[model samples]
Target: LFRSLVGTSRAIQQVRQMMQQVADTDASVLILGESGTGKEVVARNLHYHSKRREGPFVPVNCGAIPAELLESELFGHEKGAFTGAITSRAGRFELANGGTLFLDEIGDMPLPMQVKLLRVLQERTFERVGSNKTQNVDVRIIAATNKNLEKMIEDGTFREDLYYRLNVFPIEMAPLRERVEDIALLLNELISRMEHEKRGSIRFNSAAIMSLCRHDWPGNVRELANLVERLAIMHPYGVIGVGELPKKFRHV
Candidate 1:
């Protein structure tokens, strides 16, 4: 149980249902969508509802880690294993043992790391860098990526076998523009969040809301959240009219 997912739209409801359906199991969930489409939110919710909720929920950004260090980051390194190794350290897999391991931006993982990750998913065991002793882990994986993995596979940049392994339970996140029905509710939620955090709040007139609904939110909910913060800063606690909105959002 985490914060309720805001919105009454079919897309959000469907995502909610799908999360419940797989929450109790150890199945790997692959969240597919564009950035800012709440992929990480979905992952966090799923983990929160899962049996492993009491365990650590570790997240690793595959694209952000250096390719040369990716292996040690995910699987750990023994003391003196590398030039920077001052002490033995546990990797994300070890940290997430008996919990959820969120592999964000999986598409950006190097080919060699992908192969190693695939084996761990299959065998449930791995060795730390420079350690021959194999360690068994009971962690569940939930991966999300905005990248077009299919296209990457076709280009031979991604491994087909690994894709199938992680794609066992796929949940697609509809972009904000496509789910315009949720825009009004999302606005309210975002604004409320700001108020609750004592960040201040701004009101949106019906016309402003309407214009927002008509907007094509390229960055999805993230973009909407940013807009709400921006508006609050520009006009704190004031009612916003359609004409007061930024040019791109003044669709009317």
Candidate 2:
């Protein structure tokens, strides 16, 4: 029933349970974890399983965009609002009016933008840049961040009020090292996805699986997925042995 998450680990099951509970409500969700922990995938699952599944799911990476343009990206801008404003543009909120707006890496959003975001959470209305007209929206928020927002709040970088607003429902993803037992299963699931997508067909020997599981994956599932894809491309219709892996994992 799930597309992104896989495996039968207890941690995975708990995540599924949390998603189910959160998907039933429109409350703001804050997902906290290290980068590459599949935060965006969780947000997608939340929207897909929620009442707003039929609606669009607009995602914005707060850390990826420049501070100077984030506000316009989230709240849109009127024609001639800025030098490149050849025409008026709708923002993520407008695009997700009847759906979910996933605020990825929200901890990196600028202070001023955080203030405006807080206002929207409080009033469900926003005014586009260079425009006085306020627009109302019915969108659910599912924000994810790898930064320690609480620490940022104390450091005066992140706003406390916005943190509270976004942390109404929090979901924390455990790093891959913490869930090592699930690595083998994730490898299988990822390979299955590759085969289903018609990328290639491949398998790994038991030693290879153990070798991979022994390493501490700081990059989490994202790293494993990349390795799997790379192997699939490099050794289609083949079985990977422990010796075939990189030196870091060949002995492990």
Candidate 3:
């Protein structure tokens, strides 16, 4: 899976090492990190390297869907289960059978849905909404969340039992600001990709690189990607100086 990763930074190296350790095991993985920290990418790498590589990899953003529809999304729904139920559909776990199911922003999942999820994790079975039949599936579970599950549990927002179950083999992804050494490599790769897309090329001068390295990337990799794209568009064929940076990035 390292071959698929473009960078060789310490952060990426640590992530690769964790992937290697968990690739062959059936252990459930919980990726803990800030938003835009590539949690989904790490989850994909884990699925690609795992024993279930040939099977489907279904990704679901638990926080994006409405709370009322999350259960139907994860556990499927029968025809006429709700107003828009024109047909029965398989959920993430059912569709990901023989492979892995990645649940993103799981911390935002409601308490009631959390109970159902815990049951599925324990029994590997679920009942479709509006149906009594219990369907069994073989799916590896990998979850990623930006919110602090520990704090949530303490605050009684997240269930303690569910937290413990998902916490197995936890992997913490360091934020971009904490891995400043990766800035150069990340910039180069981002530039190369931009060039390949016929986006005008621009190199970051030493001062610019230093500026980027010094800034606290509150949005992590996503922010960096946006900055590189903006620079490429704004100063084609020129070196990006501190003046070319976003306002928030300039002082640093």
Candidate 4:
């Protein structure tokens, strides 16, 4: 529904427009972007703007969990399914039944889990870890990954069929370097948000602001946010200068 996203850049304007169109549909989306390029933010905005806005937005990092436990994490285990299965639990699919399920870093998901995920995408039904009964869920799927699924599929890691299923619609997040104009605007929002959270205020001088805008951010928005927060902590209510910036960026 919004973007301070494009900032002054016409290039990112089309990107946001396409993302907006997809948010209106119920199809599965595969978000492709570099790490920290705000893929999760795009996922949330899609859910927030969709009819499922009233429902929960459940997010899970597929890459973060161990492969051994991810199945249960996605499709909850029944009591005594295995060790530490003290109680029956609902998984991400069950938890997101009427909402959106954000599978962050989907490319990192181990191969075995991909088959199960494919089945659920195809059938919209899944069984718990120890349950024989299959349950259907009405959750919308928004999968994000920093990796190139194409390369993975070529390498026989990511599945081709699963890739097509998950990628009913694709949204590519423009990297920070491509949208440098947005950095200052993002800083305004990030800093304003910080103030609202009572983290205190931070100011960057004109020279330092340009320095930030000139650099290539491999880590994207997350990196920018980290720098601002670090600066705020180091010099609260103070103006930041080129000397205060990180060495590589300081010369900019």
Candidate 5:
């Protein structure tokens, strides 16, 4: 719960400010960014700092599950609603009641589900699959996605109304490459975290840091984290210089 956003860049400062501004409210938040930009991290931070911190923070990857089963996944299913529903089951919304429901990769949600989600956002009520009784929930919606919903709406894939609803408090994350100066700070934070976890740690010399700064990190902070973990394994308690860095990262 002590975890917070790590960066000194203007973009990160703005995100922090926005997060603090809305953390206490029940407003819907839509995190927008490219892949590996730590959208989920932002979501978790928001949830951690919110009034609902003591409640459940349930996350659902809207894209990972099959489209056909997504409805039952979010709204639960009554017994015998389908062949697999041998018993009634609670869904993400039910689990996150009075807390937060993080909808990751929400752009991949099917159209029917989008409409359903919009209605829930508007009415705060839903019926389980194959159930006539309506269930009311008090869940905060926080959605994140790498895709461009505007383009998707133009392409007729995403719903505009749902977009407006979720975009109530949009927080756009900057890709790591654009905030290259934050790399050093992030490295220190990550290394300290590794040390705290007793995972062992490695030091990066000034030359190595300079070299890494020049490399275009296509995978953003996630890629940097991977490199750091790999380096920790390859050179525990060792100092890393330019010559010791991977070939792709040897830019200096």
Candidate 6:
């Protein structure tokens, strides 16, 4: 399952080796990469191979939720904590107890929450919003962000203490543009999966593949997947030529 999830790229193989080294430890891992570089995928694989594999794998997108609501979403809320709270609710930490919690885009978390999160990381205990009683939890944390956390710390946007806490073990995901050797393999796997899913028959001619390889994929793997799907839908049973690519992606 681990190999299948990560495939066989040298980069992914290194990730697997690191995953093995860290899976049994209690250290928090910080995954750094540009957006769409599959940080969450690495996080999930880590948890799946950890001792807590049977436990829940909770993922929270820190940047997607509103600032006002992120606290409630992460640390739970008492029955009367906020206007919308008709009943008490468990946040990602409490819900992922004895398991793993993947915090995506963690750099976007507001400073106030950063302090509270730091406390939770230090003590393994957190109180629900509007609740005085502290609750204990044992959940491993894996945080990922596309932003530069060190810069954020210097700018006072992120907590330094929290940054150090989360950086117990750091992993950097290489962007797709830096790993052109994996492009053909990724494309073949993506195409096969598309066919399995009955999306459509799609083929990228040598010219098209070469063009794709030359481009600086700013969006990384996500962008590649999008391109493949678009080609599949638009050029079913036909070879995708350079002309078939979107204009912005053509000059590559």
What are the lDDT scores of the predictions, listed in order? 0.91, 0.87, 0.85, 0.86, 0.91, 0.85
Between which residue pairs do clashes occur in model 2? Answer: 211-252
**Model 6 pairs in collision:** none
TM-score against truth, every candidate: 0.97, 0.95, 0.93, 0.93, 0.97, 0.93
* Residue 146 displacement in candidate 3 (angstroms): 1.3
Per-residue alpha-carbon lDDT of candidate 2 for residues 148-236, written as tens digits (9 for 90 to 100)? 98899999999999988999989989888778788888888888889888899788999998888787777888889888888887788
lDDT ranking from best candidate downward: 1, 5, 2, 4, 3, 6
| Candidate 4 lDDT trough over 10 residues, lowest sum | 1-10
What are the runs in model 2 whose C-alpha is more than 4 Å off?
1-4
Query: What is the Cα-based lDDT of residue 152 in candidate 1?
Result: 96
Candidate 6 structure quality by residue, lDDT tens digits, 1-252: 332433466776777788789987878999999988878778888888898888899988887888888888898998888797887789888999999988888988888888888887888899898898899989999999999999988888988899989999998888888777777788888888788888887888888888887889999988998999888778887788889988877765
Instruction: Compose the digit string of candidate 5's lDDT tens values, residues 1-252.
Output: 647788999999999999999988999999999888889888998998899999999999988988778889899998888886787779889999989999999998999999999989999999899897899989999999999899999999999999999999999999988888899999998899999999989999999999988988989888998999999999999999988788999996
Runs in model 4 lying further than 4 Å from the true structure: 1-6
| Candidate 1 C-alpha lDDT tens digits along 205-225 | 999999999988899999999
Overlapping backbone residue pairs in candidate 3 total 0
Native-to-model Cα distance after best TM-score fit, residue 106 in candidate 4, in Å: 0.3
What tens digits encode model 4's per-residue C-alpha lDDT throughout 70-161? 88999999988999888778998899999999999998889988998898889999999988889998989999998889999999999999
Model 6 spans > 4 angstroms off: 1-10
